[PDB]
Amino acid sequence: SPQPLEQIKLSESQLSGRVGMIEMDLASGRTLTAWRADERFPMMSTFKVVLCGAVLARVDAGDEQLERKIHYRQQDLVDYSPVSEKHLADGMTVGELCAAAITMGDNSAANLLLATVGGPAGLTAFLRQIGDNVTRLDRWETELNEALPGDARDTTTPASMAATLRKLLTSQRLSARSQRQLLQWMVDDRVAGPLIRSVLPAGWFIADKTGAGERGARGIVALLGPNNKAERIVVIYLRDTPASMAERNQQIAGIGAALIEHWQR
Numbered sequence: 001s002p003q004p005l006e007q008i009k010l011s012e013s014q015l016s017g018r019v020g021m022i023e024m025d026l027a028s029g030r031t032l033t034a035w036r037a038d039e040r041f042p043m044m045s046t047f048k049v050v051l052c053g054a055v056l057a058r059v060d061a062g063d064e065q066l067e068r069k070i071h072y073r074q075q076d077l078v079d080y081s082p083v084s085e086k087h088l089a090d091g092m093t094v095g096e097l098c099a100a101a102i103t104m105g106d107n108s109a110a111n112l113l114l115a116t117v118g119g120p121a122g123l124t125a126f127l128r129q130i131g132d133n134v135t136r137l138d139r140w141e142t143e144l145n146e147a148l149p150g151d152a153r154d155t156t157t158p159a160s161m162a163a164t165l166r167k168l169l170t171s172q173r174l175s176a177r178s179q180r181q182l183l184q185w186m187v188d189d190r191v192a193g194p195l196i197r198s199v200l201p202a203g204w205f206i207a208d209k210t211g212a213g214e215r216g217a218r219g220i221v222a223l224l225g226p227n228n229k230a231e232r233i234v235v236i237y238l239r240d241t242p243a244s245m246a247e248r249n250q251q252i253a254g255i256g257a258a259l260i261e262h263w264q265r
């Protein structure tokens with residue numbers, strides 16, 4: 001594979017869409033690769049990591065408990081609820097809801113959690129509180145995945161998302177246990193985690209959260225690194241491309257291949 005930046009460019013050429021990408025050292029925040037890093041892209045389900053970061057903040061403050069069991073109704077369910085639809089009779093704990101939202105892509109679990117933090121407005125306020133003055137959530141699942149051209153709703157920028165993720169995972173804004181919990185949820189992703197490992201060379205660490213929307217919108221926020229270490233944050237978003245999901249997945253994997261082959265930068 002070619003250099004990272006050259007591969008990213010080839011991806012836009014082949015997809016006819018915009019690609020947004022940031023490669024950042026997790027420990028220090030050093031930005032290695034930045035492409036359309038200040039441009040807006042729909043977050044799609046990747047917003048779920050920020051969501052649970054807000055939940056953990058409430059837990060740290062004593063305003064929430066991951067153990068708290070929430071009982072919900074069938075009418076509360078939205079499209080794609082693989083875990084939540086199985087607990088209409090017994091409910092789910094707040095912690096279980098975050099695990100379902102992040103590791104299984106459960107949309108109803110996400111909406112239930114979003115309510116607890118003040119909805120889209122409440123989460124956006126949380127982002128402003130941690131210094132992210134760009135990212136914004138305006139809608140709920142699944143409407144937030146609409147990805148209309150020129151629509152600023154439910155968007156982030158590669159730079160903002162990378163910085164925010166780093167803040168949640170390492171800045172001590174969240175307690176030690178909470179930072180460890182958020183990290184483990186990403187490590188446990190069952191939607192794309194296993195698939196990615198199946199194609200990663202031995203020795204490479206992966207933790208992630210993916211998303212998919214309309215008009216080709218696709219994205220992934222992850223931790224990646226050799227020697228089984230979460231060395232860098234890699235954020236890649238795609239938008240406005242008519243390409244098949246397979247090819248969009250292939251292009252993102254291709255950018256990853258370029259990083260892997262040319263890691264020392």
Ligand SMILES: OC[C@H]1O[C@H](O[C@H]2[C@H](O)[C@@H](O)[C@H](OCCCCCCC3CCCCC3)O[C@@H]2CO)[C@H](O)[C@@H](O)[C@@H]1O
Nearest residue numbers: 196199200201220222224234252253254256257260261
């Ligand atoms: O010399 C480097 C490596 O070259 C290949 O590895 C290939 C691998 O066979 C392929 O499956 C993958 O595709 C990409 C797999 C990663 C896809 C997800 C990447 C994510 C990471 C988080 C942010 C978004 C992208 O590319 C690599 C690099 O050429 C060899 O198989 C391996 O023995 C060797 O160590």
